[PDB]
Amino acid sequence: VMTKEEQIFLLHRAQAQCEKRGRPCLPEWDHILCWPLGAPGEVVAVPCPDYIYDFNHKGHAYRRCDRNGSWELVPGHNRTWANYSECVKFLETREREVFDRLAMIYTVGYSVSLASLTVAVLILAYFRRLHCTRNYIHMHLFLSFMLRAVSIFVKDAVLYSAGYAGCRVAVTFFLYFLATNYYWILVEGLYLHSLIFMAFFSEKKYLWGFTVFGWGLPAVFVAVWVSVRATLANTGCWDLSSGNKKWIIQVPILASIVLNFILFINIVRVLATKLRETNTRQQYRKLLKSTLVLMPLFGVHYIVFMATPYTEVSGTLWQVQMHYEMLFNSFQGFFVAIIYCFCNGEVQAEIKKSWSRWTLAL
Amino acid sequence: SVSEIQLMHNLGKHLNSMERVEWLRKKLQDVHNF
């Protein structure tokens, strides 16, 4: 496949050969293609040009001149009669419809998550009781979800509305905000693993280290990707993929999912062990409930389609993957906010006390 | 692979094809009007 720029370039090269170039009928064909001759009063019989992208090259133009070498003109006063109408019987509504469908699904899902997460961030910030290293990372994770969503909206606005600076800025921010959200999920998983499996903690050091890892490292990967893109291709917007360089950002994000998945299984192991030590159907119920609540936090749903390479759009696997990810990824923030802020016992108790005191004072 | 990036690349190819196809469509009219 070749892009619009290539077609513009190839056409210029095509017309260049036109310049470097019954009766023969002389050039009586067009001003775009470059078979400048009408053949000796016969059907031109030139195959459909292969320099055009698809054009069903196996076909023929079947241009003709007659009488004794003259074109057959003025049917309804038309001129330069041509026969390649059957050659252009080739090649989109289906792809656009599903693209729009995916757009509406994740836009709605992201919107609800933003509203839920914003209420969650405000709740955690206002109450001083909830201020804790666990809650600081939760606020960082909740925020990262917000910047991820708003940037996607910003990217959609720029794209829907040619290598301008604003287009690049929107794309790079979207990737950086996507990466930080993924790593902050890993940070939460790593933080939980450290708590359970380590007998000593240093909040002053680990908290800052986790914050730097969550924020700084994705920026480095975006920075190196931006530097590579600018100094290697630097063609139009970065919306298109020029090759394997996309793996600069994709691979580290995927590397995080497996590590988080491994930690998730390990965390389930200790849950299955401790409940076994304290005793049954109830134990299974708690373990299953504990697994479900922790699933959205650890991003377990990402593992289903982690290792899938680029599949063609017109395929069942591609369709199910996009619907699956664009639904759960969008609503992951909403689920996390519900479980860990709205359903949190401490938050509920804190809200109840403040409301009761405010009502009593009023 | 990362889905959001993959969707972004698909959109670029889809929109670029539309520009090419619409470019072909208007060229078809111009030659028909030649």
Swiss-Prot record, chain A:
Q: Name one GO cellular component term.
A: apical plasma membrane
GO biological process terms held by the UniProt record: adenylate cyclase-activating G protein-coupled receptor signaling pathway; adenylate cyclase-modulating G protein-coupled receptor signaling pathway; bone mineralization; bone resorption; cell maturation; cell population proliferation; cell surface receptor signaling pathway; chondrocyte differentiation
Q: List the disulfide bonds.
A: 18-34, 25-65, 48-87
The principal localisation class reads membrane
Record localization: Cell membrane
Query: Motif (Important for interaction with G proteins) spans which residues?
Result: 355-358
What is the membrane topology listed in the Swiss-Prot or TrEMBL record?
Multi-pass membrane protein
Q: Which domain of life is it from?
A: Eukaryota
Q: Which residues cross the membrane?
A: 102-126, 135-156, 169-193, 207-228, 244-268, 288-307, 316-343
Q: Which keywords describe this protein according to UniProt? A: Cell membrane, Disease variant, Disulfide bond, Dwarfism, G-protein coupled receptor, Glycoprotein, Membrane, Phosphoprotein, Receptor, Signal, Transducer, Transmembrane, Transmembrane helix
Provide the record's note on post-translational modification. N-glycosylated.
> For side Extracellular, which residue ranges?
1-101, 229-243, 308-315
Glycosylation: residue positions: 68, 78, 83
Q: Consequence of mutating residue 5 to A?
A: Slightly increased parathyroid hormone (PTH) efficiency and decreased potency for parathyroid hormone-related peptide (PTHLH)
| Tissue expr | Expressed in most tissues. Most abundant in kidney, bone and liver.
Q: Which GO terms describe its molecular function?
A: G protein-coupled peptide receptor activity; parathyroid hormone receptor activity; peptide hormone binding; protein homodimerization activity
Name the disease.
Metaphyseal chondrodysplasia, Jansen type: A rare autosomal dominant disorder characterized by a short-limbed dwarfism associated with hypercalcemia and normal or low serum concentrations of the two parathyroid hormones. Chondrodysplasia Blomstrand type: Severe skeletal dysplasia.
Q: What does this protein do?
A: G-protein-coupled receptor for parathyroid hormone (PTH) and for parathyroid hormone-related peptide (PTHLH). Ligand binding causes a conformation change that triggers signaling via guanine nucleotide-binding proteins (G proteins) and modulates the activity of downstream effectors, such as adenylate cyclase (cAMP). PTH1R is coupled to G(s) G alpha proteins and mediates activation of adenylate cyclase activity. PTHLH dissociates from PTH1R more rapidly than PTH; as consequence, the cAMP response induced by PTHLH decays faster than the response induced by PTH.
The family line of this record is:
Belongs to the G-protein coupled receptor 2 family.
Instruction: Tell me the subunit arrangement.
Output: Homodimer in the absence of bound ligand. Peptide hormone binding leads to dissociation of the homodimer.
Name the record gives this protein: Parathyroid hormone/parathyroid hormone-related peptide receptor
| Gene name linked to the record | PTH1R
Swiss-Prot record, chain B:
Q: What does the sequence similarity comment in the record state about its family?
A: Belongs to the parathyroid hormone family.
Disease named in the record? Hypoparathyroidism, familial isolated, 1: A form of hypoparathyroidism, a disorder characterized by hypocalcemia and hyperphosphatemia due to a deficiency of parathyroid hormone. Clinical features include seizures, tetany and cramps. FIH1 inheritance can be autosomal dominant or recessive.
> Impact of mutating residue 24 to A?
Strongly reduced affinity for PTH1R
Placed within the complete protein, the shown segment runs 32 to 65 of 115
Q: Where in the cell is it found?
A: Secreted
Q: Per its record, how is this protein called by name?
A: Parathyroid hormone
Effect recorded for residue 23 to A:
Strongly reduced affinity for PTH1R
Region entry Important for receptor binding, spans: 20-34
Describe the subunit structure.
Interacts with PTH1R (via N-terminal extracellular domain).
* Role, per record: Parathyroid hormone elevates calcium level by dissolving the salts in bone and preventing their renal excretion. Acts by binding to its receptor, PTH1R, activating G protein-coupled receptor signaling. Stimulates [1-14C]-2-deoxy-D-glucose (2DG) transport and glycogen synthesis in osteoblastic cells.
- Top-level taxonomic group: Eukaryota
